[PDB]
Nucleic acid binder design. Structure first.
Lengths: 103, 100, 141, 53, 82, 63, 143, 145
RNA sequence: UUAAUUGCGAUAACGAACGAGACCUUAACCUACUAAAUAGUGGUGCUAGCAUUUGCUGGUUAUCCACUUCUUAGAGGGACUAUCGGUUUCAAGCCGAUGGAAGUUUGAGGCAAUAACAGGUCUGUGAUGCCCUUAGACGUUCUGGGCCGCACGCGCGCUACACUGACGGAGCCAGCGAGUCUAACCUUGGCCGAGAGGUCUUGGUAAUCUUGUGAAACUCCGUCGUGCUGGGGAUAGAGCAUUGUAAUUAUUGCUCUUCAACGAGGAAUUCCUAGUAAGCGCAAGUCAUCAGCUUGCGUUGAUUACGUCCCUGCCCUUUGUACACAC
């Protein structure tokens, strides 16, 4: 009913935008374990996008009057169009920022 | 008359050979008969701790006793009814006679 | 002799017996139409085969499904597998074997599980745990 | 002594007791064999219960 | 034990259960141009009570501008029919 | 978990050494002759023996 | 061609039966309705005072029509539910035997449902006729 | 919507049956806010008074308030089956009495001091501030201060 | 190389034995050899709703025909990686695709290596050895108190922070599980209550009776609706009761109330590879009476696992040792 373009298309655009492409892995380092900036995972990209959208929708839908359906729909549209406000996309870009910082 | 032989044993081999010899003698005697109706096998389970005292891992064991019950319903003269009932008697298998 | 074929769809415990015969072209479950069980979701799920194959193949065929066992999803899955197998048996026994083959090809192309019954039978539970593989808790002190 | 056994023991652990060792603890009422679990472990093979799983 | 808090004032919403003409005309002139309408929409974009929002939704739909897409409980969706 | 036990391997080899021409490369006929050409206490064990027997016939058929 | 409560949706048909029975008002209500909670597990009584007894009667009568022979214990088991037993975990609890028995008696009095042999109760001829008439009214009103 | 004058009839906190009640909720749950009577008795009283539940708690008539007053004064005079009440076959007389917000606490204190005076095990437990209903106190009831 | 001293193989070893496998059950696919008024179809013995249109839903035995292709059965059939590619001193093996039940020994269990704990159990014994008591004894007549006193700390768990929820109404789905003979087991009722209980046996020596165990988050119309609320019966006082010759320091169930914690819950710590995690429910065990426990089953169902030893442990080999009650 909103965003009258293709609904699966906006869904997939949100998935790609929220899918993190640089992450951090625990490197032993020696005593002080560090983070290592690792690129490359398409399956993990889509997996993390789905997980991020779901947990953001449920965090929005916890303890409030708006129902999980409209919270999830708003999160999907916000992530698809790009607003730097949705919880999934903020977490993804913050993880990206720390990954590039410790890169 | 509608007599009935029902057998409620535990040893499947003796159960099956009792049934087989009964049906084979009936077939060779050329009577009218109903097939052996074979009730579901009833398994008695007892679940108990292996240990006598309470020490060790909480490990359990299940002792199972299997009971096989079959029955056959016949109509015949009294003399041959008693003949069929009293021949082919085997230890371990318990059989009894009912009506209708 | 009214030509009826007996198939059955299976699940964890849901058994659905399907009687498919030459009639007026109806589908009924427990004497009530498949179209009017009103789940609003499982209705479409059981429509799936009928929607994908069209009404060309149910001109004068009556299919009666008697269900017993399992939850709602298990029952509808048993229903769909039984009705698919019943239509397959009808189109093999009476309609052309070529028609049966092409019907099964379309069913497989839409989904491979349409033809194959699920066999993920429940795993028995062992002592020392609440479930099949889960243990209770390992407290040391 | 008429009062030596005046108090009834019609139920509880006074009624149920092991029929091989007079042990009041661990009895298996199931199937009416009335044998404590520790003795049933020993005698099950000849009693009829057999171990499969 | 410990209260695990600071004991400060919360949101303390003033969800309207009764209104007047000054808010009725505002909601009447606002219910257009609303692509998606529900109880949450009414409450958050109107700052009105849940019961009043539900009553307004029922009355507006009984008159008829918006049409429903889902009648499922806990989630009602209404879109204005152009 | 495809490694055969020494009993299966040795029984298959013994079958091959003394009945090479009597049996062929098909599993179904191999088992349907093995059940009577060797006494085994398990249908599954017969299946394993005949499967390895077929594998060795395939091995000999090329080298 | 062919009207039957199985062929009709359940909720709308039972609502129609409730409205029809409410219009007629000749069921000989027990009189202590509006004070009972329809069960023993509910923590809050029902909502409508003069209502819900037509609903319970329609439901029981339709359930009897589906089934063959059913007694008060079966009614209670059927209408029971999980009860919030505080900290102890939820358990199934039956419905109210008194209300199930009294709605059976009311159906008996109105002739919708009658005693049957071998123990139990069966949907009566006129009760079945009225039920199918209400269902057919539903098919005529919706279509 | 329905227009009611912005008079003193709307107050942020009001008095009802010697307690304080905030409106903007259902009348039945406002009655539940009264100490000693809860949702069950409130809904029973409203339903037997035949006042519509879907109606709000804004307009209530003087005859209706007197109706509720008379119901609470003489519930048996209003044909109530006498097992909904919270004091069955009282020790003083044996009649059925329905408590008020103050009456319930006074009655509770009266039976508490009665148990203490009679020096039962229950009275001793209530004096000592322990669990009396036979609960397991070896690991529970620590933060009793 | 997967789980394997599992095998292929080189070789002072050859030939063996025990463990692993092999084996025995469990759940899966059988339109077959043989099936009963316990799961049905058409005429019928009797009858109703959509009508004189061909059917469904109903309700019953002796009045019969065709079958267990759904419950269960017994000489019993297949599945062994079958086939087709890629990879190798061109040797065992691994990785991908088909009717079909899945190609991680199909998944899961049972007993389980001449080795040892100075682990538990002398509270399971008319199994004793060594000491305790040897006619006011630990054998035993009756009354009671007690893992129910806590100042306190630690564990399997159950209910919860609720609008993916609580409640009210219409649907409402498993079987392996249990059952009176020297005097009762689970329950089918004419009457009363959301409750237990009486008159007779429809249930019996039991797939036919309880029981399709009509048992739960599961499908729809609303109320509560973010405000510490309707999630707490924690806690405490009023009445009915099955059991017990005593349920009083709620054994247990049902009618009524206060509001004390709860804004991703700190150091730490436990389980989870295909229907397992988890959620919810059912049956047996202990029982004179009640499950928050255990053993089994049923409903929905899991992203990161065919990877690695970084932590905790292992197995083999080499190695060092001042260790050998063995770090």
């Amino acid at each position: 009913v909103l965003t009258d373009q293709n609904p699966i298309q906006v869904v997939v655009d949100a998935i790609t935008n929220t899918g993190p492409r640089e992450d951090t892995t625990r490197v032993g380092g020696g005593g002080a374990a560090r983070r290592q900036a690792v690129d490359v995972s398409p399956l993990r990209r889509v997996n993390q996008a789905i997980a991020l959208l779901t947990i953001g929708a449920r965090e929005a839908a916890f303890r409030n009057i708006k129902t999980i359906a409209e919270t999830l729909a708003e999160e999907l549209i916000n992530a698809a169009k790009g607003s730097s406000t949705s919880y999934a996309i903020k977490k993804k870009d913050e993880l990206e920022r720390v990954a590039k910082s410790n890169r | 008359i509608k007599i009935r032989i029902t057998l409620t044993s535990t040893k499947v081999k003796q159960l099956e050979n009792v049934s087989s010899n009964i049906v084979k003698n009936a077939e060779q005697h050329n009577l009218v008969k109903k097939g052996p109706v074979r009730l579901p096998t009833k398994v008695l389970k007892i679940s108990t701790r292996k240990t006598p005292n309470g020490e060790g891992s909480k490990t359990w064991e299940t002792y199972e006793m299997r009971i096989h019950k079959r029955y056959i319903d016949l109509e015949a003269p009294v003399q041959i009814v008693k003949r069929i009932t009293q021949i082919t008697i085997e230890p371990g298998v318990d059989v009894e006679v009912v009506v209708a | 002799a009214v030509p009826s074929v007996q198939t059955f769809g299976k699940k964890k415990s849901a058994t659905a017996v399907a009687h498919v015969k030459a009639g007026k072209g109806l589908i009924k479950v427990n004497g009530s139409p498949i179209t009017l069980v009103e789940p609003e979701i499982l209705r479409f799920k059981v429509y799936e085969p009928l929607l994908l194959v069209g009404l060309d193949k149910f001109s004068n065929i009556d299919i009666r499904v008697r269900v017993t066992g399992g939850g709602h999803v298990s029952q509808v899955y048993a229903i769909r597998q039984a009705i698919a197998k019943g239509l397959v048996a009808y189109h093999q026994k009476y309609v052309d074997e070529q028609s049966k083959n092409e019907l099964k090809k379309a069913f497989t192309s839409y989904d491979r599980t349409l033809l194959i019954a699920d066999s993920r039978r429940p795993e028995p539970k062992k002592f020392g745990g609440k479930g099949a593989r889960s243990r209770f808790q390992k407290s040391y002190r | 002594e008429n009062v030596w056994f005046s108090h009834p023991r019609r139920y509880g652990k006074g009624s149920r007791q092991c029929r091989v060792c007079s042990s009041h603890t661990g009895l298996i009422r199931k199937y009416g064999l009335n044998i404590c679990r520790q003795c049933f472990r020993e005698k099950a093979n000849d009693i009829g219960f057999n171990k499969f799983r | 034990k410990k209260k695990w808090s600071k004991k400060s004032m919360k949101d303390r919403a003033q969800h309207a259960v009764i209104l007047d003409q000054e808010k009725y005309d505002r909601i009447l002139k606002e219910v257009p141009t609303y692509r998606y309408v529900s109880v949450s929409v009414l409450v958050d974009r109107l700052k009105i009570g849940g019961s009043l929002a539900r009553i307004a939704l029922r009355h507006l739909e009984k008159e008829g501008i918006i049409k429903p897409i889902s009648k499922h409980s806990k989630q009602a969706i209404y879109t204005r029919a152009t | 978990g495809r490694v055969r036990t020494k009993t299966v391997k040795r029984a298959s080899k013994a079958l091959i050494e003394r009945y090479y021409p009597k049996l062929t490369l098909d599993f179904q006929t191999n088992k349907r002759l093995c059940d009577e050409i060797a006494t085994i206490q398990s249908k599954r064990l017969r299946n394993k023996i005949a499967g390895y027997t077929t594998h060795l016939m395939k091995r000999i058929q090329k080298g | 061609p062919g009207v039957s409560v199985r062929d009709v949706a359940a909720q709308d048909f039972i609502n129609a039966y409730a409205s029809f029975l409410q219009r007629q008002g000749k069921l000989e209500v027990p009189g202590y309705v509006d004070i009972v909670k329809t069960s023993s597990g509910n923590e809050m009584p029902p909502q409508d005072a003069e209502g819900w007894f037509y609903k319970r009667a329609a439901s029981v009568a339709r359930h009897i029509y589906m089934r063959k022979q059913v007694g008060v214990g079966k009614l209670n088991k059927l209408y029971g539910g999980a009860k919030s037993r505080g900290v102890r975990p939820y358990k199934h609890i039956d419905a109210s035997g008194s209300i199930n028995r009294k709605v059976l008696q009311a159906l008996e009095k109105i002739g919708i449902v009658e005693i049957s042999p071998k123990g139990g109760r069966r949907i009566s001829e006129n009760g079945q006729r009225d039920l199918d008439r209400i269902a057919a009214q539903t098919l005529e009103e919706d279509e | 919507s329905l227009v009611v004058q912005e008079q003193g009839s709307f107050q942020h906190i009001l008095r009802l049956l010697n307690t304080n009640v905030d409106g903007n909720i259902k009348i039945v749950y406002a009655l539940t806010t009264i100490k000693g009577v809860g949702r069950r008795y409130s809904n029973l009283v409203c339903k037997k008074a035949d006042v519509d539940l879907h109606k709000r708690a804004g307009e209530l008539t003087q005859e209706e308030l007197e109706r509720i007053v008379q119901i609470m004064q003489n519930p048996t005079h209003y044909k109530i089956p006498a097992w909904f009440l919270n004091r069955q076959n009282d020790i003083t007389d044996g009649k059925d009495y329905h408590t008020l917000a103050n009456n319930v606490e006074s009655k509770l204190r009266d039976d508490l001091e009665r148990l203490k005076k009679i020096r039962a095990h229950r009275g001793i437990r209530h004096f000592w501030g322990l669990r009396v209903r036979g609960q397991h106190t070896k690991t529970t009831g620590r933060r009793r201060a």
